[PDB]
Amino acid sequence: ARMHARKRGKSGSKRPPRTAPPIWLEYTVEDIENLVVKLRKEGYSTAMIGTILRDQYGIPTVKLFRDPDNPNRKLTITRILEKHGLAPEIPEDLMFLIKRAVNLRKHLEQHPKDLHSMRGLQLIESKIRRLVKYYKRKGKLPKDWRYDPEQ
């Protein structure tokens, strides 16, 4: 169910089981990497790059090609960006949640009596703390990194 609202939505993607790229796909690995780098330089999010690749260039998920450098793993957008040094410093979902929290706080300064919106802020910050604990455990963030809204 949902983390807080306890609903049971089921909408999502239904990926068919396949291993090799389809026959009608004609792009090579290098063309895909060039496209990804170009789209990143245009300023898109990681989730948005894949959406554009699927919708406009007819490329289902790039996780159909083996990594040319590391044969033990498949290719992902973040790995491609890391190979060129364009990867985000902070994980994207954490950044999006922090950005949502900052905008909401300046709303609550002019509307101190909007109590129903404040609970949303509390839930957002709970999610942020869960994520920061997880990322500290895996080493994606410095151990001294801390979340302070007053910053």
Partner 1 sequence: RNVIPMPRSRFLRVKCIDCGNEQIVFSHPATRVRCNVCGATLVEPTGGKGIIRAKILEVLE
Partner 2 sequence: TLLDPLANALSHITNSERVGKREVYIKPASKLIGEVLRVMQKYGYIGEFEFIDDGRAGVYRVQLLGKINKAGAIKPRFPVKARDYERWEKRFLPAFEFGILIVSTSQGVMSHKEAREKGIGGRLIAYVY
Partner RNA sequence: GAGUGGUGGCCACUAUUAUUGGGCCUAAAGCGGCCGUAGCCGGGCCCGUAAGUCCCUGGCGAAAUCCCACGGCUCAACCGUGGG
Partner RNA sequence: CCCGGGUAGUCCUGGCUGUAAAGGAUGCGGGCUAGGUGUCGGGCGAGCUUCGAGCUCGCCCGGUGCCGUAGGGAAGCCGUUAA
> By the criterion CB under 7 A, which residues form the site for RNA?
1, 3-4, 6-11, 113, 122-123, 126-127, 129-130, 133
User: Closer CB to partner 2, residue 18 or residue 143?
Assistant: 18
For residue 121, give every residue at least 6 positions away whose Cβ sits within 8 Å of its Cβ, in sequence order, or none: 101, 104, 105, 108
Give the total of residues touching partner 2 (CB under 8 A). Answer: 4
**Contact by Cβ (8 Å): 27, 57:** yes
Cα 103 from Cα 40, distance rounded (Å)? 25
Which of the stretches 51-59, 77-85, 93-101, 120-128 binds partner 1 when contact is defined by CB under 8 A? 51-59
End-to-end CA distance of the chain: 34
Among 9, 12, 16, 43, which residue interacts with partner 2 (rule: CB under 8 A)?
16
DSSP 23: T
Cβ neighbour number for residue 50 with a 10 Å cutoff: 20
Q: Please tell me whether residue 58 binds partner 1 under the rule CB under 8 A.
A: yes
User: Closer CB to partner 1, residue 57 or residue 134?
Assistant: 57
Measured CA angle at 109 (ends 106, 111), to 5 deg? 115
- Amino acid code (one letter) for 123: L
Among 4, 54, 73, 111, which residue interacts with partner 1 (rule: CB under 8 A)?
54
User: Closer CB to RNA, residue 86 or residue 123?
Assistant: 123
In the complex, the residues that contact partner 1 under the rule CB under 8 A are: 13-17, 22, 24, 51-52, 54-58, 60
